[PDB]
Structures are given as structure tokens and as C-alpha cells.
Amino acid sequence: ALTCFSEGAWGCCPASWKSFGSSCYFISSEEKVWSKSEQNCVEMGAHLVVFNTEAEQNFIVQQLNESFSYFLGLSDPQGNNNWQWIDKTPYEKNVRFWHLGEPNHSAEQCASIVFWKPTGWGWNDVICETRRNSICEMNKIYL
Ligand SMILES: OC[C@H]1O[C@H](O[C@@H]2[C@@H](O[C@@H]3[C@H](O)[C@@H](OC[C@H]4O[C@@H](O)[C@@H](O)[C@@H](O[C@H]5O[C@H](CO)[C@@H](O)[C@H](O)[C@@H]5O[C@H]5O[C@H](CO)[C@@H](O)[C@H](O)[C@@H]5O[C@H]5O[C@H](CO)[C@@H](O)[C@H](O)[C@@H]5O)[C@@H]4O)O[C@H](CO)[C@H]3O)O[C@H](CO)[C@@H](O)[C@@H]2O)[C@@H](O)[C@@H](O)[C@@H]1O
Ligand SMILES: [Ca+2]
Ligand SMILES: [Ca+2]
Ligand code: NA
């Protein structure tokens, strides 16, 4: 089942997915390692989330549980601080919302969004083989 909204054409998302902008989003409450999280999003036709604007992140974090961290579509494969987005958008020309003091270790090659007060939601690099929740993102279905 799809839930469709008018585009002023229709923008459709799977019924259990949250809608925003030109993308659909799914918040996976099952804890997996990063590579298994990406494969789970790929099995639904999506990828791990790629943050393109601040507004996209503000919508997403309203759906999250503050007591958990969520894997993002951002990784450092060679541990050389060369962060790459899962959909090959340029990391240098894109938004970056790292927490104060992050990233902070080349061995932490995967990016996660987490709630650290007083700052709140922000990115943190973590070990990829740690099991955490994740966020998937696919484009809207236009009919
Ligand atoms: O773990 C078992 C018990 O842990 C807790 O016990 C209490 C805990 O108190 C701490 C500290 O007082 C303090 O820590 C601040 C920082 O201090 C530094 O000296 C250093 O130790 C930091 O440790 C980081 O780096 C080491 C690398 O060796 C990691 O092993 C460690 O997990 C930590 O890395 C995390 O945090 C950094 C930010 O500093 C991130 O950049 C990393 O990516 C990583 O993030 C993960 O962890 C955080 C939180 O754990 C999580 O939110 C993320 O999502 C990632 O999963 C150290 O951080 O302050 C903190 C907070 O104010 C405080 O909790 O340890 C004391 C002994 O060390 C102990 O006496 C305390 O009781 C507590 O959870 C117990 O219930 C557990 O049994
Ligand atoms: Ca996006
Ligand atoms: Ca870190
Ligand atoms: Na890192």
C-alpha cells in the first residue's frame, strides 16, 4: 500500500514510511551492523539516509528515539578521513552536522546520528561492526 500526496502529479511513499520533500524514510528499530543496515535498506529499494539539507535532518530527528543512535549513509572506508556518502554526493559540498569533537578516530569508519545533551542531535563516527538502529531513504514514487 502507498500513501500519496498531491504535488500542486502525486508523491507516493510506502504506507509505513514517513514522507518529506522528494524522499520517503523508514526508521529501523532493529539493531544491525552498518553493512547489514545498508543491505536491509537495499532490500526495501532504499539506501541509508543521505542528509542534504538541515530541514531534512530536523524532520528525521522528530521520528527518532533519543535513547538510541542511528546509522547514516556516510562512511570512511579507508580510515583516512575521506568521508563518502552512500549515493556519491560530494561530502565537501554538502551539509555536515558532526557533534562537537566528532569525528575523532580513524577506526570509527561509520557515521551515526545520536542525542548528546546539551547539543542534542548530531553526527558521531562509530565502529561499523556495532549493532545499532538505522534510517533508510528512497525517492518518492511519482504517479
Ligand atoms: O561502559 C561500561 C559502563 O560505562 C559507564 O560507566 C560510567 C562511565 O562514565 C563516563 C565517563 O565518566 C565520561 O566519559 C567521557 C570520555 O572520557 C574519556 O576519558 C574516554 O574514556 C571516553 O571514552 C570514549 O572512547 C573510548 C575509546 O577507548 C571508548 O571505548 C568509549 O566508549 C568512548 O567512546 C564513545 O564516546 C565518544 C565520545 O567521547 C564517541 O566519540 C565514540 O564514538 C563512542 O561513542 C559511543 O559511546 C557513547 C556513550 O558510551 C554512545 O552514546 C555512542 O552512541 C557510541 O555508542 C569517554 O567517552 O563521561 C561519560 C558521559 O558523561 C560517562 O558515562 O565510565 C566510568 C569509568 O570510565 C564509570 O565509572 C561510570 O560509572 C556507564 O554506562 C555504566 O553503566 C557502564 O556499566
Ligand atoms: Ca536526502
Ligand atoms: Ca566517535
Ligand atoms: Na572516523
Task: Tell me the CATH number at 57.
Answer: 3.10.100.10
Instruction: Answer whether 104 contacts ligand 1 (Cβ < 6 A).
Output: yes
Q: How many domains does the structure of the chain reveal? A: 1
Rg of the chain (C-alpha set):
15
Q: Which residues of 27-41 are buried (b: 16+ CB within 10 A; e: fewer)?
A: bbeeebbbeebbebb
The resolution in Å comes to: 2.4
Centre of ligand 4 from the C-alpha of residue 110, in Å: 7
| Residue span of the structural domain in which 30 resides | 1-143
Residue 52: DSSP 8-state: -
Helical (H) or strand (E) element with 124: strand 120-126
Q: Is 8 helix (H, G, I), strand (E, B) or coil?
A: coil
**Cβ-defined contacts of 118-123 (< 8 Å, 24+):** 120/61, 121/57, 121/61, 121/64, 121/97, 122/97, 122/98, 123/72, 123/74, 123/96, 123/97, 123/98, 123/99
Centre of ligand 4 from the C-alpha of residue 75, in Å: 8
Experimental method: X-ray
What is the identity of the amino acid at 78? Q
Q: Shortest CA distance to 24 belongs to which of 141, 125, 137?
A: 137
Cell numbers that stand for 65 in this block: 528515539
